């Protein structure tokens, strides 16, 4: 009403608006794309004082690392060096590759790997079509009886 | 002619999924199907040695069900009764600075070897960059 | 640690001059102001702190 809250629309109108707003609201549509970029990974990177390649950088949260216990535990004599352990692993599985994680959030893990397909060129192509992308893969009833 | 091609593919597609075919024939048939997703990017490379307006584009519109002529007879023999030289080193002197200054900054030698390798000097000059360092 | 302390020291003195006037603007204080020898009318301060520090 005149008070102007609670809108309700029909389908083709929404089709028109979604069509118009493409220069702005165009964006990615899989949870999977975001991956390490979602909040929880930023909250981790802040808590652990690491950085994702494109992520922001904060102050340490636990600026004191400087206390040290000098012990045979992690000595280079005893370590098998086969992999880098790049910081994306520290953020990806924070409780394993990391030690002493504090104020860390669980990262969310995985999504289904969306296969979603639409062709944007010809509006006059049908809705149901087999996309180029896809791999190639005694008795009777009465008449008038048909599908529902 | 996207649509006619598309139609052909649909017909070609129709055979593979719901039809029985010789194994050797089918696999080749499938592979073309694979390429369509691939896009032919090992099938568009060659000898385009006339510009699209320098080919006076006599695109001959034959159909492979005409009856045509093929004039074999024209393959007989017959009987036709019918600029400043630069003596300055100013181009070079600028490149003695650049090195010498990279070199007179930089504690140690491993961080002055970072800088030089970070310039990506051309192989032409790399001969004469050693001349400066010496 | 000696190199780190150099980098702090040199910036702290340059800050001494800057706060001495009233600016931290880089644009006002190009490195010629600190690094030209006194014979041309600068401070002639001798910079060991630019470098690159092995990390």
């Amino acid at each position: 009403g005149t008070s102007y809250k609670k809108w309700s629309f029909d389908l083709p109108e929404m089709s028109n608006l979604y069509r118009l707003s493409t220069p702005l609201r165009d964006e990615v549509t899989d949870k999977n794309y975001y991956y390490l970029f979602d909040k929880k990974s930023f909250f981790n990177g802040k808590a652990l004082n690491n950085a994702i390649p494109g992520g922001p950088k904060f102050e340490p949260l636990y600026p004191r690392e400087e206390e040290e216990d000098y012990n045979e535990f992690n000595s280079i004599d005893r370590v098998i060096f086969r992999v880098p352990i790049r910081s994306e692993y520290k953020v990806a599985f924070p409780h394993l590759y990391n030690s002493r994680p504090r104020s860390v959030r669980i990262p969310w893990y995985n999504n289904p790997v969306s296969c979603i397909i639409q062709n944007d060129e010809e509006y006059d192509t049908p809705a149901l079509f087999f996309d180029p992308s896809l791999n190639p893969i005694d008795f009777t009833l009465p008449e008038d009886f048909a599908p529902l | 002619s996207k649509k006619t091609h598309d139609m052909i593919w649909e017909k070609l597609r129709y055979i593979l999924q719901t039809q029985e075919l010789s194994s050797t024939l089918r696999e080749s048939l499938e592979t073309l199907f694979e390429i369509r997703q691939k896009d032919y990017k090992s099938g568009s490379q060659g000898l385009f040695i006339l510009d699209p307006t320098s080919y006076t584009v006599h695109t001959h519109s034959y159909i492979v069900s005409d009856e045509d002529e093929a004039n074999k007879e024209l393959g007989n023999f017959e009987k036709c009764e019918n600029q400043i030289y630069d003596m300055t080193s100013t181009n070079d002197v600028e490149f003695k600075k650049k090195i010498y200054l990279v070199l007179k900054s930089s504690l140690s030698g491993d961080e002055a070897a970072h800088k030089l390798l970070k310039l990506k000097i051309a192989n032409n000059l790399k001969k004469s960059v050693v001349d400066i360092i010496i | 640690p000696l190199l780190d302390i150099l980098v702090k020291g040199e910036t702290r003195i340059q800050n001494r001059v800057k706060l001495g006037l009233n600016s931290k603007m880089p644009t006002r204080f190009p490195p010629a102001v600190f690094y030209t020898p006194k014979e041309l009318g600068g401070l002639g301060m001798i910079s060991a702190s630019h470098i690159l520090i092995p990390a």
């Binding site: 690491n50 950085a51 994702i52 340490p60 880098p84 790049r86 | 961080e111 | 980098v7 520090i53």
Partner: peptide, 27 residues
Amino acid sequence: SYNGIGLKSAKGSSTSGHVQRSLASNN
């Protein structure tokens, strides 16, 4: 990425904190 190198952060630093890999020392 921060792979154990650079600083906790550049605040007390006096520098920008820009870390770059060394071309000289690899092999």
